[PDB]
């Protein structure tokens, strides 16, 4: 009745207060810096190898790219906000890391909504589905040992001193791989790498996605 | 004359009033939550199987995806708003559910305008036409029993505790299927599913679209 | 000199005034409603059949879709506005009808600018050029009687009670059809249809575009 | 040092002032009208014939389309604005003519930035690079006399009474034509046309681009 | 604890302040002018020749185009801004040069985020990854000496008097070229050119990218 109508409205107002307080908070966050670095955790759920174009050495993957990070400026005490512990918000409403594939051949295509999940400890979780075309020579995919390809993912403009990458595991998550794909996965790994260049002190970080695959 | 000019102006003003009141209403709705959950009803009107690419196992569907939900914050009393019972508004003017195909291979393409219909009880109806490419192996489509493919539709970020899905029927609406398509439909179902993994104290809900099809006779 | 520099400035000011008056007018129009219905006139000038894909039963047309309607809220007296009788404005600056093809297979592509022409009686004319891919089986296009295809056009969310459609004629305008197209037109008609749905007491209107074509002889 | 830092700042402020004065000027220009007509000058620099699709009779051109017009409302005295004689501005910051190809088969693709150059006499120069697909039958391109194609360019909604077109020359500029294209140009002309129709007692103006081409030898 | 949570807050406030000061600074920069010219440094890191279409003479490159320039208006003293020496910002938040390929056949595709890095001396670094389709005849790529193609890059609307170009080296950076590409690079150069045009006493600059490639063996 009216009590339960006012009780829905109360819970709505609490979320509106939280979001309004979180967005309008002063220094509205200017990205990671040296004095204020950040760790982004990457994982891949690999869904399909759609296409292996051997006349251009381009390979087409569909995956979920799972991103995680934690900002002090997204922290709150659930006790002050009607026991709310997490909310969904548009990814355009918040800073997100600029994680890019280093060797793509077409602009990445986003397959899912751009929505992130924020939790009271200030951790954000963003898991967009993408189709990516990248440089990969599929020679020997028609054979038993198959073909092997790699693509690096990392920040585009931030060094290791601003954004650090990590994985929870070396194993690309294959539990959602399309059972009836044209190509089967022999192995898929995601490995953290630290590079260097004697032009410069900065560590440069990436996650190296390596797939071994062959025809069904 | 002037009276029926003033009479059209009157009805316009009423709608303007309703829309302005509805949009400016305080807590301007922040999405479904646990304390304020929502049920979305899904239905499919399947129009065409356009393409079955057997060299990539991608299949191309054109369907109307019909979405329904009800918000208290979209309720009004027609008596207070010149007997207006429903209005059309741009889908960008209102919250809409984030219902996505789980196994698409290309971004979905929208074929129709993005316009929703709102009714005085607070129910919204949104029926976009889409072309979807999804993972589907068409082997045996050239045979009599045909090929079978499935795609799940569900919220992208909301659990069953926030958004619940339901169908009005298991039967995908085939009354608009292109009579002269390259492929004919042997059956098409839409089934509600609840999944429970040992991770999450929340259930997840989805609608499983399953089509059996073959090359035209 | 200065007087015909001022005269051009004057004429500019008058248009500025008209547009500013017209845009700022209170109830800034909320779409057609039952109490305030509208009639949209449709016409097709068919330019080219570009492609007939027989492996997917998709056909590609290029046409001019001519749209017409009249709003009281766009009326003015030219005498009050320096004898201005009509103006061009961006189509995004005004309400336009949501006329869609019901059986497209790809989002329509707009080939022309989105600009409408408004006349003092309140009538708007909007004529976008489009390339449309729609469901059509081209079997027999390689023969003498050719192939026949149809596509319905109509509002996406408005019933006949809100938007009525009408044509000026049954003949699709073929005077601009590409002389050297791969396909020649045997006939092209545009026919008004009144459809009803079992859920819904109100009439729906569409215009049914029917083309008979064959490969160039 | 500080003086030529203050110098650069001064020159920046002058441009700022000019642009701010030019944009904020009252009647902020409402397009050409009968009492305030305009002449647009068209020229084509033809770069490449990329593709001649003989199975759809579509031909793909890459050209620079050079546009010129003059507005009183863009005039200034360089003496009042620190001797500034011209500035670059985004094409979206100013009115531009709605010059379209009448027989395209795909939306035109813009290859260059959308930036115009404005000069103190009020003349604007806008030269976008484009790829255009248009209706053209390439039969005989494989022969010595080659194939001939034409496309008309003109305003979409403005008559000759509002926008007049003109060319500086009949010769399409071929000095930038890709030396190693698959197709060589035998001739390319751009011709002004006045079309009188029966419906409408007003000049319609267009520029007719006519290309004769054949496969490279 | 609280102190190193306040420290992080302090560091954030400092960058907030810097950006806010730099953005709000009066004459908010109007582009390079004759009195206030600019030098853009161009470099190419060539990643892959993906495709050589010999039926249309189009070639597809993927590269990193590295851009550099320096504005007085982006200068700051790190001492006033908590020793901050550089910041990342969206490329849409700042002026960027309009560097275009002069002979592309499709709009360039951007593969990377549009983010620039600004340093206290006022220098900006912007390095977008791109796929470009440009006019190039691949005859002899199937031979030992291979094929040679060229494309000019430069400002679209700015002369040498406003934007000058320069390279750090004549060698296109090949250290990131895809080891297993369909085509291998025999040489790749980037050369500054001063172009003189018939209309125009101001010189125009470009960087000429010249690639010699062949099929891998």
Structural domain spans, chain E: 1-217
Q: Which residues, listed in sequence order, are joined to residue D70 by a DSSP beta bridge?
A: D123
| CB-count exposure of residue C175 (10 Å: 0-12, 13-18, 19+) | exposed
Quick check: E123 and E67 in contact, CB under 8 A? no
Longest dimension (CA), chain B: 70
| Residue A178 to residue B57, Cβ atoms within 8 A | yes
| CB-count exposure of residue E75 (10 Å: 0-12, 13-18, 19+) | middle
Which subunits count as partners of chain A given 3+ CB pairs below 8 Å? B, E
Structure tokens at D108: 């035109």
Q: Other C-beta atoms within 10 Å of B108: how many?
A: 17
Counting Cα atoms < 13 Å in the Cβ hemisphere of E88 gives: 20
CA distance B60 to D95: 42
A→E contacts (Cβ < 8 Å), by residue, are: 26-31, 33, 35-36, 55-58, 72-73, 98, 100, 103-108, 135-137, 139, 156-158, 162
Phi, psi torsion values for D68, nearest 5 degrees = -140, 140
Q: Which residues, listed in sequence order, are joined to residue A135 by a DSSP beta bridge?
A: A58
CA distance E92 to E84: 22
Assign a CATH topology to domain B1-217. Acetylcholine Binding Protein; Chain: A, (2.70.170)
Q: Which residue is it, tokens 């807590």? A: B27
Structure tokens at E73: 């208006």
Quick check: A37 and A162 in contact, CB under 8 A? yes
Phi, psi torsion values for D161, nearest 5 degrees = -70, -20
Distance from the Cα of B62 to chain C's closest Cα (Å) equals 7
Q: Which residue is it, tokens 């190039």? A: E136
Distance from chain centroid for Cα A74: 18
H helices of chain C, where? Answer: 3-24
CA distance B51 to B45: 17
Reduce the DSSP state of residue B9 to 3 states and report it: helix
Q: Which residues of B124-147 are buried (b: 16+ CB within 10 A; e: fewer)?
A: bebbbbbbbbbbbbbeebeeeebb
Q: Which residues, listed in sequence order, are joined to residue E208 by a DSSP beta bridge?
A: E152, E191
CA distance C130 to C48: 11
Q: What is the DSSP letter of B122?
A: E
Collect all residues of chain E within an 8 Å Cβ-Cβ radius of residue A97: none
CA distance B67 to C76: 41
Quick check: D72 and D29 in contact, CB under 8 A? no
E28: closest chain D residue by CA: D16
* Binding region of C for Mn(2+): 10
Structure tokens at D35: 């009492």
Sign of the alpha-carbon torsion through D82, D87, D89, D94 = positive
Reduce the DSSP state of residue E95 to 3 states and report it: coil
Mutate to test the interface with C, among B1, B3, B6, B8 (most CBs of C within 10 A): B8
| CB-count exposure of residue E106 (10 Å: 0-12, 13-18, 19+) | middle
One DSSP character per residue, B5-48 reads: HHHHHHHHHHHHHHHHHHHS-TT-----BTTB-EEEEEEEEEEE
| Residue B157 to residue A113, Cβ atoms within 8 A | yes
Collect all residues of chain A within an 8 Å Cβ-Cβ radius of residue B55: 182
CA distance C58 to C73: 41
Collect all residues of chain A within an 8 Å Cβ-Cβ radius of residue E84: 33
A109: closest chain B residue by CA: B107
| Residue C35 to residue B109, Cβ atoms within 8 A | no
Structure tokens at D102: 């009448």
Distance from the Cα of D15 to chain C's closest Cα (Å) equals 24
Quick check: A214 and A147 in contact, CB under 8 A? yes
Quick check: E53 and E61 in contact, CB under 8 A? no
Choose among B182, A155, E9: nearest CA to C138: B182
Sign of the alpha-carbon torsion through B166, B171, B176, B180 = positive
Quick check: E149 and E209 in contact, CB under 8 A? no
Q: What is the DSSP letter of A182?
A: S
Quick check: A59 and A138 in contact, CB under 8 A? yes
CA distance D61 to D131: 6
Quick check: D81 and D17 in contact, CB under 8 A? yes
Q: Report how many Cβ contacts below 8 Å link chain A to chain B.
A: 81
Spell out the residues 6+ positions from residue A98 whose beta carbon is closer than 8 angstroms to its own.
A155, A156, A157, A158, E113, E115
Pairing of strands E58-75, C129-135: unpaired
Residue B208 parent element (H or E): strand B204-215
Collect all residues of chain A within an 8 Å Cβ-Cβ radius of residue E50: 56-58, 105, 135
Q: Other C-beta atoms within 10 Å of D23: how many?
A: 11
CA distance B5 to B14: 15
Distance from the Cα of B176 to chain C's closest Cα (Å) equals 10
Phi, psi torsion values for A140, nearest 5 degrees = 90, 5
Phi, psi torsion values for D21, nearest 5 degrees = -70, -40
Reduce the DSSP state of residue E24 to 3 states and report it: helix
Choose among D158, B34, B31: nearest CA to C113: D158
Phi, psi torsion values for D14, nearest 5 degrees = -60, -45
Cα separation values, D165 from D37, D130, D138, D173, D205, Å: 11, 20, 28, 18, 6
Quick check: E15 and E84 in contact, CB under 8 A? yes
D37: closest chain C residue by CA: C8
Q: Do chains A and B touch (3 or more CB pairs under 8 A)?
A: yes
Quick check: D179 and D145 in contact, CB under 8 A? no
B149: closest chain A residue by CA: A180
Longest dimension (CA), chain C: 70
Phi, psi torsion values for B79, nearest 5 degrees = -65, -30
| Residue A8 to residue B36, Cβ atoms within 8 A | yes
Structure tokens at C106: 């790809």
Quick check: C120 and C76 in contact, CB under 8 A? yes
Counting Cα atoms < 13 Å in the Cβ hemisphere of E132 gives: 25
**Domain boundaries A1-216, corresponding CATH code:** 2.70.170.10
Distance from chain centroid for Cα B130: 10
Mutate to test the interface with E, among D182, D183, D215 (most CBs of E within 10 A): D182
Structure tokens at D130: 């484009």
Structure tokens at B73: 């914050």
Distance from chain centroid for Cα E215: 28
Spell out the residues 6+ positions from residue E5 whose beta carbon is closer than 8 angstroms to its own.
A72
C112: closest chain D residue by CA: D100
Pairing of strands A99-101, E86-90: unpaired
CA distance B156 to B160: 11
Q: Do chains D and C touch (3 or more CB pairs under 8 A)?
A: yes
One DSSP character per residue, A111-131 reads: -S--EEEEETEEEEEE--EEE
Structure tokens at B107: 């971004």
Choose among C117, C84, C96, C90: nearest CA to C18: C84
Count of residues in chain E:
217
Q: What is the DSSP letter of A140?
A: T
Q: Which residues of E165-189 are buried (b: 16+ CB within 10 A; e: fewer)?
A: bebeeeebbeeebbeebbbbbeebb
Mutate to test the interface with B, among C57, C154, C206 (most CBs of B within 10 A): C57
Reduce the DSSP state of residue C68 to 3 states and report it: strand
Measured at the CA of B160, the angle between CA B154 and CA B164, to 5 degrees, comes to: 70
Partner-chain residue, chosen from E111, E113, E180, that has the shortest CB–CB distance to A98: E113
Which subunits count as partners of chain B given 3+ CB pairs below 8 Å? A, C
| Residue C157 to residue B11, Cβ atoms within 8 A | no
Which subunits count as partners of chain E given 3+ CB pairs below 8 Å? A, D
D86 is in an annotated binding site: yes
D29: closest chain C residue by CA: C12
One DSSP character per residue, C135-162 reads: E---TTTTSSS-EEEEEEEEESS--TTT
Quick check: C164 and C40 in contact, CB under 8 A? yes
Reduce the DSSP state of residue E94 to 3 states and report it: coil
Quick check: B209 and B151 in contact, CB under 8 A? yes
A155: closest chain E residue by CA: E113
């Amino acid at each position: 009745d009216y009590k339960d109508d006012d009780d829905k409205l109360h819970s709505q107002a609490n979320l509106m207060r939280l979001k309004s307080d979180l967005f309008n908070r002063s220094p509205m966050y200017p990205g990671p810096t040296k004095d204020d670095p950040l760790t982004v955790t990457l994982g891949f759920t690999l869904q399909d190898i759609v296409k292996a174009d051997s006349s251009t050495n381009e390979v087409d993957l569909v995956y979920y790219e799972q991103q995680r990070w934690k900002l002090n400026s997204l922290m709150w005490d659930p006790n002050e906000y009607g026991n709310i512990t997490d909310f969904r918000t548009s990814a355009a409403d918040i800073w997100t890391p600029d994680i890019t594939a280093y060797s793509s051949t077409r602009p990445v295509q986003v397959l899912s909504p751009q929505i992130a999940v924020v939790t009271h400890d200030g951790s954000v979780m963003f898991i967009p589905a993408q189709r990516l075309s990248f440089m990969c020579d599929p020679t020997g995919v028609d054979s038993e040992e198959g073909a092997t390809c790699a693509v690096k993912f990392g920040s585009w403009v931030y060094s290791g001193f601003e954004i650090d990458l990590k994985t929870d595991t070396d194993q690309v998550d294959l539990s959602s791989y399309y059972a009836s794909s044209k190509y089967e996965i022999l192995s898929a790994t995601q490995t953290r790498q630290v590079q260097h260049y004697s032009c410069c002190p900065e560590p440069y970080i990436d996650v190296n996605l390596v797939v071994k695959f062959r025809e069904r």
